[PDB]
Structures are given as C-alpha cells and as structure tokens.
C-alpha cells in the first residue's frame, strides 16, 4: 500500500555490462537542511586579498542534486573494465528517484539535540529540465554524489551569479554609478524556484525523473603515431623543396627526402603563451575572458571583470605545471598533498606542438589558434572528471571542445532542486519564525551507457589499466588504492594513471 | 542477536609488507595491489519499513 | 573450375571476439619432404652418456601437422584480450584445410639445385581421428605450427616408440635374452599408416578436416584468499582445541581463537620430495614412473626402464627451481638464455603447502598424496602451453590434472599425417630408386572457442595483462617484446608474465 510505514523504494546498485550498453546503478542516502532561513539573499563577496575580484551571489533556500562526475557512476572496477574493454562510450538514458524520505524535527533543549519526525511535514522537489533558471552545477564542483555508496550525500545550497559585479558595482567619480552601470543593474534578473510548478512530498511519497542523452561519444583510443607519420618512408615523393639562400649557404632545389614527407595536418589549437597572475586568492589564470561594455567604470584589473580560462593549453603539450589539469581528490586536501597532476596519455593526437622556422632553427609557437586541417584528440578524461557541462545559449560558437574534457550540451541533465517546506511558527512579535526540520532520503541514479567494443588487427599486446599500477597508503600504510583503511578512510588515487584515463589503452589506426 | 558481517580480504603475512626492503617485496605488493574489496551496497536489495 | 591453374583455397586469418565465442583463424605455408627414403625403420637410440637410458623408435616415411599450442592459435593481442576479458574458455570446434598444394621435383645438377613442379605428382594425407595408431604429437614439442603467420611451417617426421627398450633389449647372462624379454619382443606392434584408407591429392585438389571438442573449461580466475580464510574473524567459534601436555607446559582445553578457525580443506596433491638425477643426457626427473615385469633383465638404473615425471610439484609451491615448469622460447635457445621459468600466479589455490605439527613446530610435508577435501587450481597456463594431451586408454585412473596444464582427452584432435607419394624410378640394378620431390602448401586452422565473460562485485580494480609488462630487446635493443627486429627477428617474451598466464587477472570469490 502507501503510508508512513511503507517504503517507497529500495536500494539499487551495481553495474551490468553488455556489448552495446552498460547500466550503472547507484543509490545514496542524502541529507538536506534549511538554507538561508527560507530567504532569498543577494550577497557581495569582495575579498580584501582577492585583488579587486568580486561576485554578486543570489543565495536561495534550496539545495540540489549533482550527478556530474564519472566516479560517482562507476566503481573503479567498472571504470577499469569500461576503459579496458571499450573503444568509446556515451550516456544514453538517466533515471533518478528520490524516495524513502524522512523529515525530522530538530529539537535543541541545550547542548543535547534530539530528533523526532514530523509525519505531516513535506519537502519541495523541482527538476529544471528546460534550464529556465541559472544552472546550479558547474564542472569540477565538490557537490557531486559520493563515490562510496555507503557515504552520506550532503546537498549544497543553490546560488547563482545574477550579474557581473564590477559592471554593476556603481563605483566611480559620479555618485550612484555611471549611466551604463546603473542600466546594468536596472536589469539584473532575479530567479525564484517558487515561480515554477513543482512537487511537495511527504514521507510516504516519492518522485522520479528521466532524462535522455543525445551526445557525442567519449572515445577511448590512442594514436600510436601523429598524423604526420602516415606516409611510407620507402617510396619516394614527387614533392620539391626549395630552400632560399641563407647566409653563405646557396639556395637549393631538391626532392624532399622520403623519410620526411610534407604533412597536411596542423597542430590543434591551444595557448602556451599566457601565465597565471597571483595572488592565489584572486582569479589566477593565463587568460581572462572579460566583458567590458563602454561606459562602465573599472577600478580593478582584468581579473574581476572577467573569468579565468583554464586549462589554457589545448592538445598542445603543457610547457609548465601551470598549464596542466590538476585537482584535489578530497575536500580536505590542501597544498601539495592529495593533488593529482595530469600527465601525458602518450596518445599522439595529444601533446602537440607547433614550431616555425626562422631559416636557422625552429622556434615554438606558443599560441596556436584555429587553423584549417587541425587534427587533435579531446582531453583524456579519467574516472574523476565532470561528465558534462552546460553550453551557453548563444548565436554563434566555434568547435565545442572544453579543455577539461567535459561534454558541453545545450541541455544537460536537468538539475533537481530540493528544499525543506517551510513550517511557520506563531509569533506575537511578527518575527519570522519557522520550525527547524531536515530531510534525509534515498536517491538512486540509473544511467544506461551506450558502449562500443574495439577491434584491432594489431598483433602485439596493448596497454591496459592494471591494479599493479595502484599505490599503497593509509594510517598503517598497508592499504592499497581504492580500498578502505583501518579508520574507514578510503584510499584515494595518488597519481593520474591510477585515475585510469581514457585514450591510453586501445591503439588506433589513423 | 545478529552478528556483524566481516570477511578476510587477503592472507595477511603475504600482504604485510615486511622484510629487509622498504615497502615490502615486489610479490607482496602485487598481492595487495589486488586485494578485493566488497560492499553489499553494490548489489540491488530491499529497504523495508515496519509495515 | 578446377585444375593446375586454379587455387583450391585462400588465406584465412585473424580472430573474431563475441560474448559466448571466439573464432581464431590461422593459415600457414608448410613444407614437407621425403622421410627415411620411403622406408619404415626401427632404430635404437642408446646414447653412451645417456646413463643406460635407451629408446626403440619406429621412424616412418611420414610427417604430421601439430596444432597443439595456444600461441599458434592466438596473437599476443588476442591472447591478452582473451585472458583480460574472460573468466573461462575451451575449444569448441576445429576446422583444418590443406590446399594450394605444390609438388616440385628437386634437381641436383651440382652445387646448384633447381626446382620444377611435377603436375601429376601427388601427396598422401591421412587424419587419424580414432587414434588407431600411436599418437604423433606430445605436449611441449617444437613441431607445432609457428606463431608468426608469415613463417614457413616445416613438418616433422612421424615416429613412435614400439616398446620399452630395456625390457626388450635381450641382455643378460642367458643368450638371446630371457624368456620374458623375448615374449615382450615376440609381441611388439608395428604400425603402417598405409594400412588405413586415406587420400592422395594432386596440386588441383585439397582436403579438409573437422573436429568437435567436448572439453573441460580452462578457468581464468584467481583466488584472492585460500579456502582456509573463508570464515569470519569477528564471530566466535564453538570449537574446542585440546593441547596435550608438552614438556613443562600443562595440557589445556580452550576455545579456538576467532581469527583461526579450523579448515575442512586440505592442500592439493604434489611431490616436493624428489630430486633430479644427472647427468642431463639421461632422463633427469625427481620421479620415475617405471614398468618392470617379473622375469625381465635390467642392467641399468630406474631411468631407462621408466619415464621421468615432471613437473613433480602439484599446486604445491615449488621449493626449488627444479620443480618449476621451464621451457626455451625458440629451438635455438641453449643454456640460461631464452628460457622462461614459471613464477607464481599469486592465486591462492596455487602454491599450496602442508605442514604437520610435531607439537613444537610445524615441518613441511614434502609429498602430498590425494586426500579427501583437497581444493586446488589447475596450472596457470600461458600463451605458450600445449592446449591438450592424449589421455592413455586404461581401465582405471585418478583425477586427471596434468601438472604442465595441458588438457588430457580420450580423443584429442586427430593427427593429420602427410607424406610425399613415392615416384619410383627404373633401375636396371634392382636398386630402390625414387624421384626426389617435396610438397609445399597452405594449411589453415579455424578454431571456435567457447568463452564466458566474468562478473564481479569487487569494488576495487583488478590486475590485467599490460604491454607495459613487456621488455625491450633486439640487435639494436630498441625492439619491444612480440615485435620484429631489424634483422626480422621476432622478439620473444623474456619472462613468465610476458607470456600472459591465466589465473592472474580476474578475482574469484570462493
């Protein structure tokens, strides 16, 4: 039946591998609490050491489910088998369920806090599938579902940047701001999730959401040679090379050597030319993408009217550690420990470089723009990467290849928003008084993954991801990677190869 | 009274990384590098309330 | 149509992977020549340094196809993918074809030899599928089909041991041998392949042979724990251990500790007790299986009336290098180079040991016979192993588990025998004169392999075979394993793991 004593779902988990598809199933226990005391608020974060960088933030009384990472949908076993056995994969269909909800009242009698459920209390659930509201999720956020199925998932408050602050900040000689800055505030949108229709559930209820992906494949393959090596060294070429007079060397006309043939295929795009600009508390990137309408007043540097573009490097080989993708494996990691620095996948469509001859030597071209006949592989994503990102709605765009490796889509999976229904309290003073409550429940995500198995005429063995590439750590230093410790600590991958990137194992004939 | 479930993942003296060499021998480390880890949450199963 | 200018087949090659089956296809160019000058002969090999060991050998004017190894049916790529992606495999159906035959006449005019074809010449082909004749093939022979499809396959002369020599050798005080030895010669069988019906082909003809396997699986899985670790350490046991009085220690009765529970499962069988007996030119094994009827005269030692039993060790952990499986990778290998010594698969159903307490310490039991409740894994075969062996026809036998890892069958794939049809020459002197000819042709072997994909609830990554486990060698030392050299030399696997054994990658819950 249905009621308070009947569960609305069950635990779903594991994976199913087939030839043409993989089904991953993940359930988590999540917790949500009241945010902003049921208020919408617009705050200005303006760090003193932020070197003039600022944000406007509308914080909402809402929290949201973020499913975007690979590690949350794949065990390390399943990710290994995925990247070892398949040439490519993409998401096919997502199905998420929120069920087994429990709304407890929080009673503070003192230092001791007690918990008893309000059976008539309720919870708001809203999935935004048309992206009618500012997107909650962003790639590489820590809000994502946990990797370990038995770890609790704590939802993060939803907030959005209503405006670019330095454009709206009403600073300058004139009082009240310039005419252009005021015009940019006079229209600053304000979004409330309460403006949409959505669901209110009690403990005996549940909700489910389906999403259909239509996506480009994630290709797991490596180029064993660059596109320039695709010729045959033994056959001569008809091509002639003329070399102009250089100093005392006479100009010559000769047949190009058989072992260097000319290539038609350029280095992929990328920027090696920029450099990060401290301090670390500002936005530090080799490149700022800025918007600066005419008539605004800017008292800061490029950071703070613009966003840092990172990784700047494309398929180009990073010439410095600043250009490499890097992330901390846990939220408690700081400094040089817990960080994973990306290393080459040893694919020959990655780590490209472009040199121009000055007729003496070749010198590196740092900034490689889009140019015809460019051939490159997209970034070698690992088990920890964002799966997707939100593609901005715009008139025009170039080739969409986010350098972090996430897949940009017009409509990604919609964000499911959840908040505690407000339970007002009588107040003789007309104060705003609500009952303190929280919801815990079980959220499951089933994703169907369309996959393709490789076929190779290669005679020789190929690289595969092996547990022998794992490292040993822990409190007692006996615990291998992706295993729990004596304290229950989950041993994180130390290095980029332990994250099992794609575009490593399976060779590819160009 | 139900008892806690637990299992022996590996034979310890083979995995214990003891010896003259630091960090264990190459064979003992290979025996840890694959030590299985099982979670019952990886399976589908049932959640029941009182009714 | 059909004739001299029409080919009777084509080159077949490669592999096809599916979920439930794998199809391997291999074609080779083979060569055969006249053997024993078209005679049957019985030779006694009796090496002076053989330490009294001898054999009777009936050599035949026949050569034979030997398909038994894994490396001939699988590329290293295909073998890798087989052992990485599948928990078990067995042969299903074999199909072999001999076609595109060419019989050339060999003309020796001097130091120069010329070759022109006899179009009316023919070649005998006989497959023995009932094993009506002594089996040609034996495990670990070098007669097997080559690994590289472009290398020529030279067939080996067929011969068989008619009798055990020291029993038949008519040695002793009495002249002409004892009554028992003479009785063992008076019946010594003699086999001619000409006694069977078989096929004679000319260049425009071809023959094909099908074989259906019914076999036990080859299991690719590893035990991560021994069968003795299958308990739960945290729950107590009801079992009591009584320890008798030892010296000044009082006899005690106590509950067995929770972290050692008693096991029901014994060490598998094996012999660690024997030792090889030189010199290397005799039969050197830790154990001789001998036959010594009463009334025979034996002037030698155990070697020469018996056969060496090697590897003596079972699933037992080899305590010495003598007990380890070892082979040379090429026929030209000698000494300590080119040899591959088997190393542990790190499966816990292998490398077993048995100790008995003397009530002070535990001492190793060297010879472990069959005992109830024994649990072990069969040998971890590699890409170079015999696939099958011939099981002897006998009334009674114990569990069949050849320690080399080959699969013993009542009827293996039949041996295809081939010889050059004799082309007699007129002789006024009544000499035996034949025309000197040889046959080259193309032989293809298609095997269907029934396979099974693994399923695991293991969270953590598992070991896999990786090209990064390969080593680099060659004339210029730039050539990686399983690749050709500058001279065209094929770089052989140096170590046992490069041969990619089974029972390594895929974990198994006992």
Structure commentary:
The structure is cut from a larger assembly and holds three copies of chain A. Chain A is mainly beta. Chain A is built from three helices and 30 strands. Chain A has helices at 76-85, 165-168, 179-186; strands spanning 14-17, 21-33, 41-45, 55-65, 86-108, 113-117, 123-128, 153-154, 156-160, 199-201, 207-212, 218-219, 222-223, 240-243, 252-255, 270-271, 288-290, 306-308, 326-328, 339-341, 355-357, 362-364, 367-368, 388-390, 407-409, 415-420, 437-453, 472-473, 479-480, 507-508. In chain A, the strands form ten sheets. In chain A, strands 1, 2, 5, 6, 8, 11, 12 and 27 form an eight-stranded mixed beta sheet that branches. The longest helix of chain A has 10 residues, at 76-85. The radius of gyration of chain A is 27 Å and the shape is globular. Chains in contact: A-B, A-C, B-C. The B-C interface holds B 3-11, 27, 30-31, 33-39, 42-43 and C 222, 224-226, 229-235, 344, 346, 348, 457-463, 507, 509. Chain B: It is found in: Virion. Chain B: Belongs to the parvoviridae capsid protein family. Chain B: This is Capsid protein. The PDB classes it as virus.
List keywords for this structure.
part of a larger assembly; 3 chains; 510 residues; mainly beta; eight-stranded mixed β-sheet; six-stranded antiparallel β-sheet; 4% helix
């Amino acid at each position: 039946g249905s009621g308070v004593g009947i569960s609305t779902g069950g635990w779903v988990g594991g994976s199913h591998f087939a030839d043409k598809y993989v089904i991953t199933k993940n359930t988590r226990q999540f917790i949500t609490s009241i945010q902003n005391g049921h208020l919408y608020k617009t705050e200005i974060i303006n760090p003193s050491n932020g070197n003039g960088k600022s944000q406007r933030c509308v914080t909402t009384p809402w929290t949201y489910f973020n499913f975007n990472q690979y590690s949350c949908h794949f065990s390390p076993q399943d990710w290994q088998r995925l990247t070892n056995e398949y040439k490519r994969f993409r998401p096919k269909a997502m199905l998420v369920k929120i069920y087994n909800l429990q709304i407890k009242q929080i009673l503070s009698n003192g230092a001791d806090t007690t918990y008893n459920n309000d059976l008539t209390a309720g919870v708001h659930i809203f999935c935004d599938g048309e992206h009618a509201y500012p997107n909650a999720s962003h790639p590489w956020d820590e809000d994502v579902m946990p990797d370990l199925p038995y770890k609790t998932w704590k939802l993060f408050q939803y907030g959005y940047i209503p405006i670019l602050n330095e454009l709206a900040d009403l600073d300058g000689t004139t009082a009240g701001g310039t005419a252009t800055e005021k015009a940019i505030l006079y229209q600053m949108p304000f979004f409330m999730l309460e403006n949409s229709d959505h669901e209110v559930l009690r403990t005996g209820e549940s909700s489910e959401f389906t999403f259909n992906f239509d996506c480009e494949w994630v290709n797991n393959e490596r180029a064993y040679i660059p596109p320039g090596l695709m010729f045959n060294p033994k056959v001569p070429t008809r091509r002639v090379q003329y070399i102009r007079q250089n100093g005392q060397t006479t100009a010559s006309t000769s047949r190009i050597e058989p072992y260097s043939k000319p290539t038609s295929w350029m280095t992929g795009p990328g920027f090696l030319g920029g450099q990060r600009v401290g301090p670390a508390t500002s936005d530090t990137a080799p490149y700022m993408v800025c918007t600066k309408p005419d008539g605004v007043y800017i008292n800061t540097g490029a950071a703070g009217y613009g966003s840092g573009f990172d990784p700047p490097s494309g398929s180009l080989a990073p010439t410095d550690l600043e250009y490499k993708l890097q992330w901390y494996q846990t939220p408690e990691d700081t400094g040089n420990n817990g960080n994973i620095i990306a290393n080459p996948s040893l694919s020959m469509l990655r780590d490209q470089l472009l040199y121009r001859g000055n007729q003496t030597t070749y010198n590196l071209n740092a900034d490689v723009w889009m140019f015809p006949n460019q051939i490159w592989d997209r970034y070698p994503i690992t088990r920890e990467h964002p799966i997707w990102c939100k593609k901005p709605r715009a008139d025009k765009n170039t080739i969409i290849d986010p350098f972090d490796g996430s897949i940009a889509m017009d409509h990604p999976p919609g964000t499911i928003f959840i908040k505690m229904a407000k339970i007002p309290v009588p107040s003789s003073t007309n104060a705003d008084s609500y009952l303190n409550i929280y919801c815990t429940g079980q959220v499951s995500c089933e994703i169907v993954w369309e996959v393709e198995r490789y076929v190779t005429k290669n005679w020789r063995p190929e690289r595969r991801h092996t547990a022998l590439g794992m490292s040993i750590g822990g409190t007692e230093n006996v615990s291998p990677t992706y295993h729990v410790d004596s304290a229950g600590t989950y041993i994180q991958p130390t290095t980029f190869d332990q994250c099992m990137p794609v575009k490593t194992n399976i060779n590819k004939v160009l």
